[PDB]
Design an enzyme around this catalytic site. Sequence first.
Site, PDB file in Angstrom:
ATOM      1  N   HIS A  23       0.843  -1.188   0.000  1.00 27.56           N
ATOM      2  CA  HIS A  23       0.000   0.000   0.000  1.00 27.56           C
ATOM      3  C   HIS A  23       0.877   1.235   0.000  1.00 27.56           C
ATOM      4  O   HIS A  23       1.500   1.568   1.014  1.00 27.56           O
ATOM      5  CB  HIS A  23      -0.934   0.044   1.196  1.00 27.56           C
ATOM      6  CG  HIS A  23      -1.810   1.262   1.204  1.00 27.56           C
ATOM      7  ND1 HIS A  23      -2.641   1.575   0.152  1.00 27.56           N
ATOM      8  CD2 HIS A  23      -1.989   2.231   2.132  1.00 27.56           C
ATOM      9  CE1 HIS A  23      -3.296   2.689   0.434  1.00 27.56           C
ATOM     10  NE2 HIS A  23      -2.909   3.110   1.624  1.00 27.56           N
ATOM     11  N   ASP A  25       1.074   5.144  -0.428  1.00 27.70           N
ATOM     12  CA  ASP A  25       0.378   6.427  -0.453  1.00 27.70           C
ATOM     13  C   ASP A  25       1.099   7.378  -1.396  1.00 27.70           C
ATOM     14  O   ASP A  25       2.324   7.521  -1.325  1.00 27.70           O
ATOM     15  CB  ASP A  25       0.329   7.046   0.950  1.00 27.70           C
ATOM     16  CG  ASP A  25      -0.546   6.240   1.923  1.00 27.70           C
ATOM     17  OD1 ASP A  25      -1.684   5.924   1.531  1.00 27.70           O
ATOM     18  OD2 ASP A  25      -0.105   5.943   3.064  1.00 27.70           O
ATOM     19  N   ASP A 145      -7.828   1.471   1.316  1.00 26.46           N
ATOM     20  CA  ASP A 145      -7.678   2.408   2.434  1.00 26.46           C
ATOM     21  C   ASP A 145      -8.656   3.584   2.548  1.00 26.46           C
ATOM     22  O   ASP A 145      -8.819   4.115   3.651  1.00 26.46           O
ATOM     23  CB  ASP A 145      -6.234   2.940   2.427  1.00 26.46           C
ATOM     24  CG  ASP A 145      -5.833   3.559   3.760  1.00 26.46           C
ATOM     25  OD1 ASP A 145      -6.330   3.125   4.815  1.00 26.46           O
ATOM     26  OD2 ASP A 145      -4.999   4.488   3.735  1.00 26.46           O
ATOM     27  N   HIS A 386      -5.889   9.726  -1.418  1.00 27.45           N
ATOM     28  CA  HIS A 386      -6.796   9.703  -0.277  1.00 27.45           C
ATOM     29  C   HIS A 386      -6.248  10.404   0.970  1.00 27.45           C
ATOM     30  O   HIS A 386      -6.986  10.469   1.963  1.00 27.45           O
ATOM     31  CB  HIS A 386      -7.241   8.256   0.063  1.00 27.45           C
ATOM     32  CG  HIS A 386      -6.127   7.279   0.301  1.00 27.45           C
ATOM     33  ND1 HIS A 386      -5.590   6.501  -0.709  1.00 27.45           N
ATOM     34  CD2 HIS A 386      -5.510   6.886   1.441  1.00 27.45           C
ATOM     35  CE1 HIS A 386      -4.660   5.712  -0.211  1.00 27.45           C
ATOM     36  NE2 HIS A 386      -4.587   5.925   1.092  1.00 27.45           N
TER      37      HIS A 386
HETATM   38 ZN   LIG Z   1      -3.355   4.969   2.447  1.00 29.33          ZN
END
Ligand SMILES: [Zn+2]
EC number: 3.2.1.24
Lengths: 933, 929
Positions: A23, A25, A145, A386
């Site tokens: 994951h 970001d 997420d 996000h």
């Molecule tokens: Zn995230």
Amino acid sequence: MKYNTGAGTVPEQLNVHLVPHSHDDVGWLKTVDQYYVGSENYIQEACVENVLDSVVMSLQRDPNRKFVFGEMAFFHRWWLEQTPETKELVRKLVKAGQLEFVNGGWCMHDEATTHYIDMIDHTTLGHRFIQEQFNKIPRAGWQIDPFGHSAVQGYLLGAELGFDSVHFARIDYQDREKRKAEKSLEVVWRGSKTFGSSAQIFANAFPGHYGPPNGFNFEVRNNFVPLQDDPRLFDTNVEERVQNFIDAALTQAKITRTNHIMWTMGDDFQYQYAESWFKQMDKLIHHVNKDGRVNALYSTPSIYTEAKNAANQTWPLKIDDYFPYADGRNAYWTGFYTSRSALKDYVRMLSGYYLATRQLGFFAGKKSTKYHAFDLADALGIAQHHDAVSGTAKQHTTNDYAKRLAIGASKAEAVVSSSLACLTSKCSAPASAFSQCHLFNISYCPPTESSIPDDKSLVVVVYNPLGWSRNEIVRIPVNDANLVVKDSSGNKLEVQYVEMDDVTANLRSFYVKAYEGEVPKDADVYWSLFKASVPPLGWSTYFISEALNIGPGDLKMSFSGQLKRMYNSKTGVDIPIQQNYLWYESSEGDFSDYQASGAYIFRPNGQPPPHTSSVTRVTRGPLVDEVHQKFNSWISQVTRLYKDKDHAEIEFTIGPIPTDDGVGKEVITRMTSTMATNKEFYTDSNGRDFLKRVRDYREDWPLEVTQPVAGNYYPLNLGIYTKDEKSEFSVLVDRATGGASIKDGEVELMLHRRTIRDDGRGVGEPLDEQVCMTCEGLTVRGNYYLSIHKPAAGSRWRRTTGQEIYSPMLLAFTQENMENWKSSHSTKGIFMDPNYSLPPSVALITLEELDDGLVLLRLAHLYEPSEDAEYSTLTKVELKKLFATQKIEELREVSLSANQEKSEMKKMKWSVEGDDFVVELGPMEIRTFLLQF
Amino acid sequence: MKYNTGAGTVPEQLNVHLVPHSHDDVGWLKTVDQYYVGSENYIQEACVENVLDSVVMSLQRDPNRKFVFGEMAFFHRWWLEQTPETKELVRKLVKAGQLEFVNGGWCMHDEATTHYIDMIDHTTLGHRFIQEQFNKIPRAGWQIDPFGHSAVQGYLLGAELGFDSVHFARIDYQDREKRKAEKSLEVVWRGSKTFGSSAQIFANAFPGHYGPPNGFNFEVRNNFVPLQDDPRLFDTNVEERVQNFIDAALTQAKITRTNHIMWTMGDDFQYQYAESWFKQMDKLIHHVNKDGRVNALYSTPSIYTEAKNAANQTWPLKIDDYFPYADGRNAYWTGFYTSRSALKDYVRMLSGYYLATRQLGFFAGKKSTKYHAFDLADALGIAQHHDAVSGTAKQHTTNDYAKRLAIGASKAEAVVSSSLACLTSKCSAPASAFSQCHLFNISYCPPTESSIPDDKSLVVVVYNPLGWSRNEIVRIPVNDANLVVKDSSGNKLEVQYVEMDDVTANLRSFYVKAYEGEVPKDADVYWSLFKASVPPLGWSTYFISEALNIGPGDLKMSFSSLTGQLKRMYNSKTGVDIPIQQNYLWYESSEGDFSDYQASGAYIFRPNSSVTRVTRGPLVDEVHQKFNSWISQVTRLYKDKDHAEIEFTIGPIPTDDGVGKEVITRMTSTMATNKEFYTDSNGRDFLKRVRDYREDWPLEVTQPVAGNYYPLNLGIYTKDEKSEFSVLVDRATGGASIKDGEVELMLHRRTIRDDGRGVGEPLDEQVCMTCEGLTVRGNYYLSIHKPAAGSRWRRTTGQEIYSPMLLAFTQENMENWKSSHSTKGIFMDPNYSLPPSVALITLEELDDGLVLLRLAHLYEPSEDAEYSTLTKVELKKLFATQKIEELREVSLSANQEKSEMKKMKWSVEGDDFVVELGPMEIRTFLLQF
Ligand SMILES: [Zn+2]
Ligand SMILES: *[C@@H]1O[C@H](CO)[C@@H](O[C@@H]2O[C@H](CO)[C@@H](O[C@@H]3O[C@H](CO[C@H]4O[C@H](CO[C@H]5O[C@H](CO)[C@@H](O)[C@H](O)[C@@H]5O[C@H]5O[C@H](CO)[C@@H](O)[C@H](O)[C@@H]5O)[C@@H](O)[C@H](O[C@H]5O[C@H](CO)[C@@H](O)[C@H](O)[C@@H]5O[C@H]5O[C@H](CO)[C@@H](O)[C@H](O)[C@@H]5O)[C@@H]4O)[C@@H](O)[C@H](O[C@H]4O[C@H](CO)[C@@H](O)[C@H](O)[C@@H]4O[C@H]4O[C@H](CO)[C@@H](O)[C@H](O)[C@@H]4O[C@H]4O[C@H](CO)[C@@H](O)[C@H](O[C@H]5O[C@H](CO)[C@@H](O)[C@H](O)[C@@H]5O)[C@@H]4O)[C@@H]3O)[C@H](O)[C@H]2NC(C)=O)[C@H](O)[C@H]1NC(C)=O
Ligand SMILES: COCc1cn(CCCCCCCCCN2C[C@H](O)[C@@H](O)[C@H](O)[C@H]2CO)nn1
Ligand SMILES: [Zn+2]
């Protein structure tokens, strides 16, 4: 030793689908580039280059291994650094199915504070790259997420993209308990009330988190238990590790339908050394399958979905959305619906601008720069992440987002200037041909503030990027009180002068220096106003040179000194209405729960919101009636009723929010009527569908009320409205905003937030935004728009004004002799057929030149079936009239992200509990085309 | 982008040789297998499997990258798990020079507490694997971590191995300051007085650490500054990093001779994800060389050495050794010379047993098992690691070492029992044929304690693994008082019964339970003693059945009587006579003061009576001495022994008063030793030590005790114009002379604090079931001689201490035994011994028909007028029952043809089958039969 890693699924055992992932970001505690190169590890240990580097090496080692990757902002940066040899290895790995793209957009976007236009844009950016390099079409959505989920995510950024499935970890904590008990974590999701089962998707809510079961995180340097299967070494532990695996699988199987479950084998920025994970998964697949009680396999979310679909199973149904999201009793993640208001407005403003920019570049013949370094496409697509537009990144990261947006805005501004110079002459024009102003909010516009030499006029070119003809009030800051505005035909136009105010002048001095680096000339003395009229997708030109009830129209408002009433004479709607400014006190924890209000979570003090009030000016004129209001030293407002506007336009100026008293404050405007709204109110989904919200109620589970305010806030990207038998009261926003109805007849907007504590979800920072040179709290300025209508009459105002807010006029300035200008320039033009307009129900949301000669076109129907008896109907667009000055050689309909032929798209089938060039468009439809000229 | 990683050296610039490495302890905070597989990361983040997995992936990506690896204990464990494709890839990387083996032994051995035979053995184990799998000969020694360096490391485990260089980070902190100022960090080292420049080596002491310059550790998840050279990304920093590199290079260049410096690009258990290092090193080579002010390249310690050798440069000279090591004023790393005495004795005992095991297996036709899981070769190799026998690992790691050694010993035991069964018969015989005892030290020997059936005897087979015939006292625990001992010919031998003592009986009940899980039978009542006479490399068989002045020989000792305790030793035949007292003392462990927090611990030594029995007999006179409740001793003068054997029993060291104690025996005489004393180098050369003095720098005295301790593996001696006083040890031991005429041994240590060098554990050894401090028992050996006559006692008795008789037991009727079994035997010629100056240190069956043979000359040129001379060995007489078909002389680690060995030249400041051996020579051979 040779491990049997090539297992598939088997029919009569529990199958454990191991899905390796990382994951990543696109900015959060570090910036995007810091995360990519792996710098600033003292902030967070994270390097996406190591992920892609080492995953590719580990995948090469064994053809049965699999990995899924999502965020093309990272992949594309990585790809441009790779050798031809590596790029070819990646092609093999992708072709074999060892590396599968899931989601495949530029980022994994927020679903609360994002606009559907931007979601489509960045997703297309990613999908075109994946289609071009690999000839692959992503089939599984990946939203593991984002903090709650929107209806449009399901049907439009899921089903209509061609995704069979979408996978996410976060749902409401009470809801999650019910779904485990009911085995309804996985559902068939029908996010559109219009399209129903024709735009449905398999939705997989994970049991808890998007990480592995406990003891199955295998990141290098972590303290996991390695599977020791070498009898030449001490302490073999095969049987223990196999039983560990089985125990975790059986627990999950108890809450999942079918003999197939999925393990998300990864976490935040994991796989810096991929082989650490794959070594353990190799051994576990081998030994677990030799054991034989369950079956383990390398898999992906789309292989998993395929097994879920082939099972003999009926599935529960999911309607509407998953907002709001709470992960605990006093932890509703509804604060970020508003957090970082200024960044939210910046995104929304640049998105409209970028839309117009691609229109003008297409007509002027400009070349696509989509994949160029620091292009606005990269910057706006990153901004949808996000933690980005959502407001939940660290401050330095947030500054980096805005820096990237400003760089892209500067490139787009040059494209617009050069393009308008070419298109208005009678393409190589210099970008200096026109000047443009983006700081009207603080009154700074040197082109209109400067003096006009004799025999010359301030030339104002007005471009309208809507497919509708439009009338609007141009309002520019000037230093002369006897200017004359002439249209293209020499007629002097009616003007109104508005006096500069002290709030705006005080904003100008501080913020011009902050944004632009130098202290500006004196505050302008006046605003000059005049009404411009512009053809659809076209321009008009104007020439400027030297020579208590309000409402110039049907909508009237009554004030003391504060608002008391709104009525429309012509339509006969009339409500008593008050509007005030208040703020919730941010909780900092209490005896029963340490949870603080912060950038993610709105937790109000549980005290009533403190009250702020005097009128400071009432102004009347032919173009605008104004009421200037000061509620305290940091909250001021201007209410404006403009000529020919079916609404009031309320300009808020909030800040600096004082926290020297040690009290965090979350500022709302609250509009209180007597309408019998019966706990109901309507909020949009990413600016499209309106969802009926009901106070303190959930459709999917019996809500235990724990936050009677924070639990009723919803994310707004178009606006909020209410109604009773006699009235419909509507509010439109200019940026992602949180909104609620806490009392019947009452609507509120959260506009700005400043806390003293962090909310303990990892950002490590109170939401304490300041501007410096000598610092103070950030001030935000913006508009919300309010109006009243008879029932069934408000939807057309909401849709029409929403699009107008999204796509305002573009102004371009220069000083030339009027006659000389009219001699070398066409003062009026339209790229559509001179007597053609798009239907009132349609917006041209995408028009963009791609590589080679390909043009991407998207048309949206703005109305839901039951909104407007005239406009919620089938309509048509004549593309020959849309491109009057060019001939369509090729037309081809594609999927929403333009990576598939429309006619080739296939859908899975699910058993659900409870069961010429003329383009037609039904309600809520969006059609996407590739054109050649 | 493609990076110019293929750079080589350039003559007109400073060259930075980047040497990627991972320092992998063969056990320390975690066990060797935990380190390998990466378990227990909460103790220390370290996984050697990841190092080798990811280094091989990183080297494969770019043929210009290099990496050096040393510890074959880890490499071999990894190798056997690899697929055929990976093995093939590794052979290509090694053949191209991308992966280079440095050192190449099983571990990176300590140089203080190790014996040269064990050093040779594990180095051969690693080098034979390297030669067989890759046809490679390591040329650089890698000693980056050991705490001090021995002269034998330089000349024997360096030069004689075929190494051109040896590299190390640790030297005394005062020495280091001088060597920086004089640019004498790098030297030509001549460790052997005897061989001088014929066994010299380039010795490279690093400026400070074996890691990279500050800011150039690139391990995954560490907070380093990546070199960001992509203009499509923010915050490029090429100029900054290139300048960071240059600044570090120029700083090092100012203390280094020639235009070549080496960066050791690695650290403890680094390269878990090798690509993290190679990415930065790729970009630094590229952009530093684009800049052009200095030059960077991928390199190895051997490539670096070649560059230094090719320079027109003369080098300072180094003689003798680098002991003792101190890294601070109050931080002499001389405690570990004694730390974990019981582990050290365990290693020493098993090394001699393993020497005998490989002899006996060879004679009996047993197959080699050197690379089998848990073989004693692996356990003993691992035990040489610089945290293992040195005693500086965690307690749980130390327990694991002893468990591996016990596993290996149990396998060796079966080989010895099976071999002796075949060889004494008239190989297929079971291990049950004989029993053997390893717990005589606590009087536990069931085979001899047990009753004998009527018309049967206790058969005692006595094997002698020396090449000298040997007479020695057999001393076994028995339960009958009227036993008769007959030799093989039927003659009844003189015997002596010795009473059991209280101290031993209490050791027996507690330690037998600890070691074997159950309490023993009744303590034995007597020791039966008798003198055995055994041929060299042979055996004798004996049959046992039912029917204050001391000194039975020339050497005598006088004890006060009023207090016990030695007063005088004298030999009546040679005329030597010196008054001399022997006492037990302890230093109090420092726990630091307000000016220096350094405490005494496992690495660092930082200091702050009654005769209970006199026994006389024809075989031993002894004096039992009780010094306190946890210190007792028996002083023994055995028949035909030119020395006293002093058995100490120390422990549990009381610690409840809150003060740690470090126990010594101190022998005080009036000899005019004049601050001088002599200690051995890994059990070989004796070096003259001088109290509070250093040859290579002007010592600033800060620890007048701790700075004068030296590691002993053979012994320590002093001398004046009239006498030589010699002390031999039975295990690695620290010794010193703190005043003239005075010599002391540290025998056991217990601290209450850790010494802050990473092990995180006080040296607080305990035996638990209830816990008490560990008790150690052992012997040291004292003797006196006329000048120039002590050396032959030291060398001869040293080999006898190293290689004692092996006893094997069974019960059989004597006549039926003599009818089925050869009672007497030797594998050499019936009347041949090795010369008194020679030891057979290696005799071992390899794979196929190859046998490995090593002969050592035990004497230095000045030591013994008779024995310090050229000698010869007749190999046909060494192997009497077999015919030598082929002989080949090889290097010391047996990885090179002896004749094809080449030496670099250095300009140094200040400049048939009969085997001949000169003093201190070791010759190694491969034989075929
Ligand atoms: Zn995230
Ligand atoms: C109204 O309306 C509006 C709209 O219109 C809205 O909104 C808004 O808007 C505006 C506009 O208009 C905007 O503004 C903008 O912004 C942006 C952003 O900003 C931000 O950020 C930044 C950055 O940050 C970063 O960095 C820093 C330093 O270091 C730090 O600190 C931070 O933290 C961060 O960091 C991070 O990151 C990084 C990376 O990135 C890293 O490194 C680190 O480590 C970390 O991680 C910042 O800086 C800023 O700040 C500022 O501001 C603020 C406010 O905001 C304040 O408070 C502060 O204090 C500051 O200020 C101060 O300072 C300044 C400076 O110094 C001064 O001036 C002042 O005065 C003061 O004193 C922020 O935070 C930006 O970017 C922009 O800027 C730009 O522009 C301008 C004009 O326009 C100018 O002036 C400037 O200078 C700039 O310029 C540039 O850019 C451009 C484009 O953009 C161009 O064109 C030019 O040319 C330039 O550039 C070039 O050159 C240069 C030299 O100079 C260089 O640098 C560059 O480069 C780059 O890139 C490249 C590529 O190309 C690469 O290669 C490299 O690497 C580099 O990088 C180029 O070449 C503007 O300003 C705003 O933002 C907005 N807002 C919001 C909130 O959002 C509004 O709101 C309204 N209002 C009402 C309603 O009321
Ligand atoms: C509570 O007060 C502060 C404090 C801190 N500390 C401990 C500092 C420890 C540093 C260790 C550095 C790394 C190397 C350690 N080496 C690693 C080698 O591979 C190994 O073989 C060596 O045995 C070993 C020892 O040198 N003590 N007190
Ligand atoms: Zn070490």
